[PDB]
């Protein structure tokens, strides 16, 4: 059985084929416009890929239950606190669902060999990607499913780390009720895995660590002149 609250969360999920198709098409046109001598560095492609993923994340949040009740200033503070976490969580779940050994599945629907990516990404992003893959392997061994994924999305979005909120009580209530719903759901659907609920929660600090370190690296690359938008606005704020 599924707690009704989780059903309401599932109702808010985007149509993932449409999201990926739109991003794939955007990036195709971008490269098409570019002359022979001005193509995008692979790092630059990933930045634009992440940029366009952020647009869909904002659109998802603004239409979601609970979030749509917040005033816009509260909505901005939540997304500014968790945008990078949501990008990483989405990346991780994509590998859990579609990931094969030795390759990375991108939001465009492209499968890319890790040996290609690791050649171009540099030590820092390779480290963060490898740590993310460790979470992928752990989540796949626990049978991380879509109901749990949407719970973690909402726990990331409605973070107690966000200060200066006009309606902090709603954020606290969502955090608490989604927690109780996840606890119940894992207990009913995976009774044998006593460790599952805790192993899910303990990924959130790790995703937080990975995403904040990812933010700091990208801010470095921006300051260094390496980044081309929404991604930059989120970094600064």
């Amino acid at each position: 059985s599924i707690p009704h609250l989780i059903l309401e969360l599932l109702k808010c999920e985007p149509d993932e084929p449409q999201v990926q198709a739109k991003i794939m098409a955007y990036l195709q046109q971008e490269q098409a416009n570019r002359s022979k001598h001005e193509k995008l560095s692979t790092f630059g492609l990933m930045c634009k890929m992440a940029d366009q993923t952020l647009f869909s994340i904002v659109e998802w949040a603004r239409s979601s239950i609970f979030f749509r009740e917040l005033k816009v200033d509260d909505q901005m503070k939540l997304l500014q606190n968790c945008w990078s976490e949501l990008l990483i969580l989405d990346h991780i779940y994509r590998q859990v669902v579609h990931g094969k050994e030795g390759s990375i599945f991108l939001v465009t629907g492209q499968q890319v060999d890790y040996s290609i990516i690791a050649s171009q990404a540099g030590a820092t992003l390779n480290n963060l990607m490898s740590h993310a893959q460790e979470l992928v392997a752990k989540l796949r061994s626990l049978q991380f499913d879509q109901r749990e994924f949407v719970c973690l999305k909402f726990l990331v979005l409605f973070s107690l780390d966000v200060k200066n909120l006009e309606n902090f009580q709603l954020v606290e209530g969502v955090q608490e009720q989604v927690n109780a719903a996840l606890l119940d759901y894992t207990m009913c659907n995976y009774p044998q895995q006593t460790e599952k609920f805790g192993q899910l929660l303990l990924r959130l600090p790790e995703i937080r660590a990975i995403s904040m370190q990812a933010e700091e690296y990208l801010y470095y690359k921006h300051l260094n002149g390496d980044v081309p938008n929404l991604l930059i606005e989120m970094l600064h704020a």
Partner: peptide
């Protein structure tokens, strides 16, 4: 962050 506000306010 005018861009984020716009994405949250736009029709």
């Amino acid at each position: 962050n005018a861009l984020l506000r716009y994405l949250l306010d736009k029709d």
